[PDB]
Amino acid sequence: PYWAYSGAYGPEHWVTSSVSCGGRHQSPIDILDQYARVGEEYQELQLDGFDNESSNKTWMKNTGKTVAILLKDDYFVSGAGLPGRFKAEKVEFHWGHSNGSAGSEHSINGRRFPVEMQIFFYNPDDFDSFQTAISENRIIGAMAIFFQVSPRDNSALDPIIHGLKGVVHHEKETFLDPFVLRDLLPASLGSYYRYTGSLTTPPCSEIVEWIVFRRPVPISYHQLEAFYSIFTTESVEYLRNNFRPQQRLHDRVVSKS
């Protein structure tokens, strides 16, 4: 079903086509740190494969709603209260309008960031593929990483920024220079929030265990310009402010490491 980030098919109308979008446990949310429960003693995030350079087969697409990276290497996460081990499938990005304006889906104490990168994972022990996993409404995992402006270019982002320059037009695809996935995550992985939520685009399935990192990854204002230059169609517009409005916590508790 067609959906958009504004207009008659905008987020307040998603529920018409995708019923889950009007559910009680939706994402993204604002995280009030005061109300985050230190909760269980949880195994620290265990990352496998994140230090390896990416395959030259890894590629990036302008979907018109985001820019997605389809991962071609094996990356695994466990710990942080997730049930078992999860395998990374893809990366997507949400950003603002100009000059570092708010673009994140999540926030912390009302504070937004100019970009939010989300990495999506499925449990390979249960299914052969990420698509299989979503079709069955089983638990999938997602990490949310904020970017924050810094005076210098973040060299770790170079291959991603270069990719953006190659996918300005809707539907365009490009291979990416090798990057190290670990280096697109915060320097410390020790500080994060956990909650149960949903996909932030239709079908808005309420099956996502979110890990939201508290500390951001740096990006320069110059690098941000590569996001602001992306186009989307349907009629052409800049692809900007591509974030879903925040959803109510309701009966949920957010945990923190």
UniProtKB/Swiss-Prot annotation:
Please state where this protein is localized.
Membrane
* Disulfide bonds, paired cysteine numbers: C21-C204
The segment(s) forming the Alpha-carbonic anhydrase domain are 1-257
Q: Which tissues and organs express this gene's product?
A: Found in a variety of tissues.
Source organism, top-level taxon: Eukaryota
User: Glycosylation annotated at which residues?
Assistant: N52, N56, N99
Q: What is its quaternary makeup?
A: Monomer; active form. Homodimer; inactive form. Interacts with CNTN3, CNTN4, CNTN5 and CNTN6.
- Say what the protein does: Possesses tyrosine phosphatase activity.
Q: In which family does this protein belong, per the annotation?
A: Belongs to the protein-tyrosine phosphatase family. Receptor class 5 subfamily.
Record protein name field: Receptor-type tyrosine-protein phosphatase gamma
Whole sequence portion shown: 58 to 320 of 1445
